[PDB]
Symmetry: C2
Subunit: 279 residues, 2 copies
């Protein structure tokens, strides 16, 4: 299975357009210690030519350009993107759909609620009805949007996505409020886990001076602590642990930081845009 992480940041990206926290400020200055990041999205393929897009972020046009895997093939309307899956209806998950409009056939997958919400916005009609097939999917239902690629959505404490091809398994869970034994049982054995890395400490955004809400308040389990994701996930088998959906206020974004080293020392990769996996 081929994986490309198109966007590794949480909503707002890195930097965020109206943020001047210490991390974003480094990015604005073009300091090498902080790599700019687009908003969460990954692409997965069973064969390396036909791809499923997971969520369509506001940065999708930049993501397609930056990643050769996404570049159109020779001829008319010949994109490697065959399907798009929406895991939720948030603006940072659907705004990219407005870019995918120029008569390109693909299949859009989502739950009935999300598809209905999209259809309730006429601006998304740029995905022409005679061009883009809109297909409802149920939770816990396995389907095959690309031949050889099995996809299943499942609830998490909000949905996670289980992707399977050629005996390999990837769990994609960019948003997670808490790690349960139930969740761990689902993840265990996966060749790769891409997991909510929004905040390092519960009070990241407060310390950064950009907000008053804790990670808990916003539905994001923090990385650190006995109750954190790293500790909670440490005793199950996972081929590759990767943090995605990283907020601009997270100090793991700083390339030479102790925090980054600490998270890597505990077996976690901090994702950057264009990171690839061949499982």
């Amino acid at each position: 299975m081929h994986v490309v992480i198109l966007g590794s940041a949480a909503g707002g990206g890195v930097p965020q357009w109206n943020c001047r926290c210490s991390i974003c400020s480094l990015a604005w200055a073009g300091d090498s210690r902080v790599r700019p990041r687009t908003q969460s999205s990954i692409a997965v393929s069973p064969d390396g030519e036909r791809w499923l897009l997971l969520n369509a972020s506001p940065d999708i046009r930049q993501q397609i350009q930056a990643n050769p895997q996404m570049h159109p093939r020779e001829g008319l309307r010949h994109s490697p993107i065959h399907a798009v899956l929406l895991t939720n209806g948030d603006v940072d998950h659907v705004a990219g759909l407005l870019t995918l409009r120029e008569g390109q056939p693909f299949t859009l997958y989502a739950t009935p609620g999300i598809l209905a919400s999209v259809s309730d916005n006429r601006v998304f009609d740029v995905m022409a009805a005679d061009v883009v097939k809109r297909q409802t999917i149920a939770l816990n239902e396995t389907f095959e949007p690309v031949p050889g690629l099995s996809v299943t959505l499942f609830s998490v404490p909000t949905v996670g996505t289980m992707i399977e091809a050629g005996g390999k398994r990837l769990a994609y869970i960019p948003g997670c409020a808490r790690v349960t034994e139930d969740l761990k049982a689902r993840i265990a054995g996966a060749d790769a886990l891409l997991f909510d890395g929004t905040v390092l400490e519960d009070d990241d955004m407060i310390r950064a001076g950009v907000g008053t809400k804790t990670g808990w308040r916003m539905g994001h389990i923090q990385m650190n602590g006995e109750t954190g994701s790293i500790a909670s996930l440490a005793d199950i088998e996972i081929g590759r642990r990767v943090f995605v959906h990283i907020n601009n206020t997270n100090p793991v974004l700083i390339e030479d930081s102790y925090e980054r080293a600490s998270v890597e020392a505990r077996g976690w990769t901090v994702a950057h845009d264009g990171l690839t996996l061949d499982l």
Copy 2:
């Protein structure tokens, strides 16, 4: 007056995500003959610190990053973007609004028809009502969205946006649906008309005397997209007067006085995008600049 062209391409940008025409292919390969471009948007300021955004493209986050003028200032929620004005309801002009959502105060300006069309989409509620003021402006009404910067809206012949197209489609008519903008600060005048189906004597009267004109450069010939092999739609069909011909924009605008002529909103299929093309040389010889991203004007 400070002007920065944030995006100089038409809808789709250059390259377009699903296009492999000869121009886009050069861009995909990183060939120097074609500079990559983001979608139509410019920013204007009377003082260089407080800015009005004209249109909000799908590339707006990249445009803000690439242009230091747009970078947020020290402190909390401190952006140089004070206001946004929409010239029409096309996706390449409004999609960027979804990015401007994180509690940042500004005023969104548009004609009543365009604002209503936008507001009818609940996805744009991410511009919170207690944060973003939505202010309608009438045709021919002058307003001042940034101190020292006067803006006037006026109707231009256009086409209704693709996502609002219908069986009795409007093409070339003058309504609240498509506007050009006259921008003035410190005695200098800028005309910004990224979309225009045809040039009227009335429009020429509006433009005449302007220090700069930034104008619809979507297609060189009516059949650009056909010649490029990417589509069947004519320039007329898409609501864009072509550059060339006795009836084209270059000829139509040649006999009025303009300090600086600049083409924006250029489609990926337009050969003026090719740096060394005869076509590019031809339009420059007739007094026109072909805009690129990050192009600045200090009027």
